[PDB]
C-alpha cells in the first residue's frame, strides 16, 4: 500500500514495484555505499521493464521532484540518488539481463554490475569486455562516465566498445540511440555522465577473451629521492614506450609504491619489458607477482573480497573521501610536490587509512588515447595520467572523525600537489572517481573540459528541465 507517499501511490497505479519507507528493502536499496554520503530519496521504485521505468518517469513528474536512476549504486557521491536528497530513485539492479547474439553483440539491461555481466559474456561465446575490477559496479554509471581498467590501455574504455541502447527521456518517452540515430545523445550517454537519460539496456560489441593474460606486480623499495626518479622514468617509459598489450597502475600509500596490472601475453614476454624499466626506474625494486592466467583468472586477481557474482542482493558500504584528477606529462615540479606530500604530509590516526592509484591511462601506446576528444563525450583523451585518491575511515561506526566536519583538506592538497602545476584547461577529473566537494561549476568543467558546452546543448534538447539532474551534472545550456 501506498500510506504517506503520494508517489508510491502513483507507482502502484502504474504496476510499478517499490519500497515504503518503513521496508528492509528500503534500508538496503535506501542506503548509499559510501555512509559518508548517504541520503534519503523521495521514493524508491524498482522497474522491472523498459515500460516500468518509463510509467515510473511519469509518476516523478507528476510529483514534481528530480528522477535518480540507480545502477550499481556505487558512486562515490551517491548520485544513484540524485546526490542529495529528495529524487525519486529508480533502483534497476534487478534488470540485469546480458544476451550475446551470433555477432558477438551483448545487450545488457541497465541495472546490470560488472562481476555478473563478465560471467555471461565468457559464458556465452567466451566473450570479454573493457571495464573495471570491482564486480559490484553497475555497468550503468561505469560506461556513462566511461569505464576504465586493467584493459584500457589495450582496449580502451568501456564506452569504445558501446554501439547502441534503448532509453527512457525526461519526457518519459522511449527512443533508440547509436552513432545514426539520436547521435546526440548517444555522444553524451559516452562519458557525459548521469542525468541524459535513463538506459534500460546497453547494446555492446565485444572482443574474444584472450587466450592468456599475465598479471603482474613490482614492488619498490624507493626512498624521497627515488621516487621522483622513478617517476621521472615511469613517466617517459609511458609515452614512448610502454606496448599496447600492457596496462598498469600504481599502487601508492605511507609506506609502498608498488606497479601492477596485465600484460595481453605471455610472462617471458612480459619480463623482457619490465626489466628494462625497472632498470631505467633505478633499480630497487622486484617482481613479486608474475602468473599466466585468463581472462576469468585475471578477474578474479582484483576482487579485494568482493563477491564476484552480483545481483540484487547487495548490502556493502564504507565510508570514505574520494577524489581524482587527470593531467598531461609532468614537469619535475609536480612529481617533486607530490613525492614530498607523502613523505611529509601523509600521516592518518590508527582506524584511517589512505591509497592512490596512478593509472597509465593515455600516451601514444594507449588504445584509450587512440581516440579523439571530439569522438565521445569522454574529455581526457589527451591527458596521460589519470588519478584516484581515497581517503578512508575503517572504524566508522565508532568514529568517523576528522569527517563529517573535515578531512577532505588531507586529499585535496594532495592533488594540488599536481594540479597547481597545470595549465587551467589542462585541469581536470574523472567522473566515475567523484569528489563531492566540488560545486555544480567546478565540477562540470574538470569532469567535461573541453566536451562541456557541447553536452549542455545536447542535455537541453533531451532533459530541458533538468528531471534527471544531480548535485553536480551537465546543465540544460543552449547555445
Ligand atoms: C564502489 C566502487 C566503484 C568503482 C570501482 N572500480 C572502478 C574501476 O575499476 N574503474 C572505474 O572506471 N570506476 C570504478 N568505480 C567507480 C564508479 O563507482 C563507477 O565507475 C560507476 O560510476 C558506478 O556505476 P553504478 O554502480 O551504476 O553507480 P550509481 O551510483 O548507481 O550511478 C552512477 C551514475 O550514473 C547513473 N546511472 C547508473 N546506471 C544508469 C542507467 N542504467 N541509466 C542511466 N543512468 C545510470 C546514475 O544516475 C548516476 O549519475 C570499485 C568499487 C568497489
Ligand atoms: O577504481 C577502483 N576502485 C576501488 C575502490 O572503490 C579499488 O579498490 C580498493 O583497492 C585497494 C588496493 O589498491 C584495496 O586495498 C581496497 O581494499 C579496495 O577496496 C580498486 O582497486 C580500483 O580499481
Ligand atoms: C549468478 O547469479 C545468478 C542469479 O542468482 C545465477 O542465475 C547465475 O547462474 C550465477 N552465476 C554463476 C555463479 O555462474
Ligand atoms: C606539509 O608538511 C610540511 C612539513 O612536513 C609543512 O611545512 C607544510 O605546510 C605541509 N603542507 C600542507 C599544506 O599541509
Ligand atoms: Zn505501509
Ligand atoms: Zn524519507
Ligand atoms: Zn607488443
Ligand atoms: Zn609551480
Not at 518503513?22 to 523521495?42: C, H, I, K, Q
Not at 562516465?145 to 564506452?159: D, E, N, P, V
Not at 527521456?169 to 547509436?178: E, F, R
Not at 612480459?270 to 607477482?289: D, E
Amino acid at each position: 500500500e501506498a500510506e504517506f507517499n503520494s508517489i508510491n501511490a502513483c507507482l502502484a497505479a502504474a504496476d510499478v514495484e517499490f519500497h515504503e519507507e518503513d521496508s528492509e528493502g528500503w534500508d538496503m536499496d535506501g542506503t548509499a555505499f559510501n555512509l559518508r554520503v548517504d541520503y534519503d530519496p523521495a521514493a524508491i521504485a524498482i522497474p522491472r521493464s523498459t515500460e516500468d521505468i518509463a510509467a515510473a518517469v511519469q509518476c516523478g513528474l507528476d510529483a514534481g521532484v528530480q528522477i535518480s536512476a540507480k545502477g550499481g549504486g556505487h558512486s562515490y557521491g551517491s548520485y544513484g540518488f540524485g546526490g542529495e536528497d529528495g529524487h525519486l530513485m529508480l533502483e534497476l539492479d534487478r534488470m540485469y539481463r546480458v544476451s550475446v547474439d551470433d555477432n558477438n553483440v551483448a545487450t545488457i539491461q541497465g541495472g546490470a554490475r560488472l562481476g555478473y555481466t563478465a560471467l555471461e559474456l565468457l559464458d556465452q561465446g567466451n566473450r570479454a569486455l573493457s571495464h573495471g575490477t570491482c564486480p559490484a559496479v553497475g555497468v550503468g554509471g561505469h560506461v556513462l562516465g566511461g569505464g576504465y581498467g586493467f584493459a584500457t590501455h589495450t582496449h580502451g574504455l568501456t564506452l569504445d566498445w558501446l554501439i547502441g541502447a534503448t532509453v527512457v527521456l525526461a519526457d518519459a518517452s522511449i527512443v533508440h540511440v547509436s552513432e545514426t540515430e539520436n547521435a546526440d545523445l548517444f555522444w553524451a550517454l559516452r562519458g557525459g555522465g548521469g542525468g541524459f537519460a535513463i538506459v534500460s539496456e546497453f547494446e555492446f560489441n565485444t572482443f574474444e577473451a584472450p587466450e592468456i593474460i599475465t598479471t603482474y606486480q613490482v614492488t619498490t623499495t624507493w626512498n624521497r629521492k627515488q621516487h621522483v626518479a622513478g617517476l621521472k622514468a615511469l613517466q617517459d617509459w609511458a609515452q614512448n614506450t610502454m606496448p599496447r598489450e600492457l596496462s598498469m597502475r600504481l599502487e601508492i600509500n605511507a609506506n609502498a609504491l608498488n606497479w601492477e596490472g596485465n600484460f595481453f601475453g605471455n610472462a617471458k614476454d612480459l619480463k623482457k619489458i619490465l626489466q628494462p624499466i625497472m632498470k631505467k626506474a633505478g633499480g630497487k625494486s622486484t617482481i613479486s607477482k608474475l602468473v599466466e592466467t585468463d581472462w576469468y583468472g585475471q578477474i578474479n586477481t582484483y576482487l579485494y573480497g568482493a563477491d564476484l557474482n552480483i545481483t540484487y542482493n547487495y548490502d556493502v558500504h564504507e565510508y570514505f573521501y574520494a577524489n581524482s584528477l587527470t593531467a598531461p606529462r609532468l614537469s619535475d615540479e609536480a612529481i617533486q610536490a607530490f613525492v614530498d606530500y607523502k613523505f611529509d604530509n601523509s600521516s592518518v590516526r590508527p582506524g584511517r587509512g589512505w591509497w592512490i592509484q596512478w593509472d597509465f591511462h593515455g600516451g601514444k601506446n594507449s588504445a584509450l588515447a587512440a581516440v579523439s576528444n571530439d569522438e565521445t563525450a569522454y574529455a581526457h583523451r589527451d591527458q596521460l595520467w589519470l588519478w584516484q585518491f581515497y581517503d578512508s575511515i575503517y572504524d566508522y561506526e565508532n568514529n568517523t572523525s576528522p569527517y563529517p566536519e573535515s578531512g577532505f583538506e588531507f586529499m585535496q592538497g594532495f592533488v594540488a600537489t599536481i594540479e597547481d602545476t597545470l595549465p587551467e584547461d589542462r585541469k581536470g577529473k574523472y567522473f566515475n572517481y567523484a569528489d563531492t566537494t566540488l560545486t555544480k561549476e567546478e565540477a562540470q568543467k574538470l569532469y567535461w573540459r573541453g566536451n562541456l558546452e557541447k553536452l549542455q546543448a545536447i542535455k537541453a534538447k533531451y532533459d530541458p528541465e533538468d528531471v534527471f539532474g544531480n548535485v553536480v551534472s551537465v546543465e540544460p545550456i543552449a547555445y
